[PDB]
C-alpha cells in the first residue's frame, strides 16, 4: 500500500492568449489567469485512481513557486489528493526557476516523506521542457517511467505502458519509481463543487527550497523572448 507524491505546476492557462514583454525579457505574466498544467491534472488523476483501487495509503500534492501556487494545490486537494506541500519561491526567483531546481526539491522531498512513487505530468506548457520527471528520477537514482499511457502494480514492480514514436512500448520497473503522465494516460476528473469545499479543510505545509538543502543559482540565462514569425522542393521543405 504505497505513498504517492504528485508534482503540480501553476501555469498560464492554455486558453489565455499569451503576449510578449515589450522589453523582450520574457512574456507578460501578471494578473494573467493561471491554472494547473494539464499533464499535472492527469498525474493527480492517476494518484487518485490508484488510491481508489486501494493500492495507495496516501497522496501528497506539491508545487514550486509564489504563494499563488496554493490555488493549484487546492485543486489537487479537491481531486482526491490527501494533503499539500507548497515550496515558496518569491515571484523574483520563480522567474529564474527551472526543472533542475525542482527535480532537486522533489528528490529531497520524496526521500524526506518516505514515498514509493513520484507522479509528474509529461511536460509543462509554459517552458515546454519535459525534464523534471527524468531529472528527479536521476537524483533519487530511481527508475523512470516516462510518457505513461498505462500503469499497474505487480507487487514490488510497476508495469508501465508508454507512448513512444512508433506506438506503445511496455516496461517493468523496480518500485521506488518515477512516472510522468502522458496525454493518453487518463481523463482527469472535475473538481466537484462539494469537494472544492471539503478540500478547504485539508492541510498544506508551506516551506522553502533553502530548507530541504537545495541551492537555486542557475548557469542558464534567457537572452530574449521574441515573437514567432515541384514536389521535389516540398518534401524537402517538410524535411
Amino acid at each position: 500500500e504505497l505513498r504517492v507524491l504528485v508534482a503540480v505546476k501553476r501555469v498560464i492557462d492554455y486558453a489565455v492568449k499569451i503576449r510578449v514583454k515589450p522589453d523582450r525579457t520574457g512574456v507578460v505574466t501578471d494578473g494573467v489567469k493561471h491554472s494547473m498544467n494539464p499533464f499535472c491534472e492527469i498525474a493527480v488523476e492517476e494518484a487518485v485512481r490508484l488510491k481508489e483501487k486501494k493500492l495507495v495509503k496516501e497522496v501528497i500534492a506539491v508545487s514550486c513557486g509564489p504563494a499563488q501556487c496554493q490555488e493549484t494545490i487546492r485543486t489537487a486537494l479537491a481531486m482526491g489528493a490527501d494533503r499539500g506541500i507548497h515550496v515558496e519561491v518569491p515571484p523574483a526567483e520563480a522567474e529564474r526557476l527551472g526543472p533542475l531546481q525542482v527535480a532537486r526539491v522533489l528528490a529531497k522531498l520524496a526521500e524526506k516523506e518516505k514515498v514509493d512513487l513520484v507522479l509528474l505530468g509529461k511536460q509543462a506548457i509554459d517552458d515546454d521542457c519535459n525534464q523534471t520527471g527524468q531529472m528527479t528520477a536521476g537524483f533519487l537514482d530511481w527508475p523512470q517511467g516516462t510518457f505513461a499511457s498505462q500503469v499497474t502494480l505487480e507487487g514490488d514492480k510497476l508495469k508501465v505502458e508508454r507512448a513512444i514514436d512508433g506506438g506503445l512500448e511496455t516496461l517493468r520497473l523496480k518500485l521506488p519509481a518515477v512516472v510522468t503522465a502522458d496525454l493518453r494516460l487518463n481523463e482527469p476528473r472535475y473538481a466537484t463543487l462539494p469537494n472544492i469545499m471539503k478540500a478547504k479543510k485539508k492541510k498544506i505545509e508551506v516551506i522553502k527550497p533553502g530548507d530541504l538543502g537545495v541551492d537555486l543559482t542557475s548557469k542558464l540565462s534567457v537572452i530574449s523572448v521574441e515573437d514567432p514569425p515541384t514536389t521535389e522542393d516540398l518534401v524537402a521543405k517538410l524535411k
Binding site: 491554472s35 490555488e71 487546492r74 485543486t75 479537491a78 472535475y190 473538481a191 466537484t192 463543487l193 472544492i196 469545499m197 478547504k200
Partner: peptide, 15 residues
C-alpha cells in the same frame, strides 16, 4: 474567493 474561483473553473470546464 479562491473557493468561488474553483467553482467558476468547474462550471466553465463543464460549459
Amino acid at each position: 474567493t479562491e473557493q468561488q474561483k474553483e467553482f467558476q473553473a468547474t462550471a466553465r470546464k463543464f460549459a
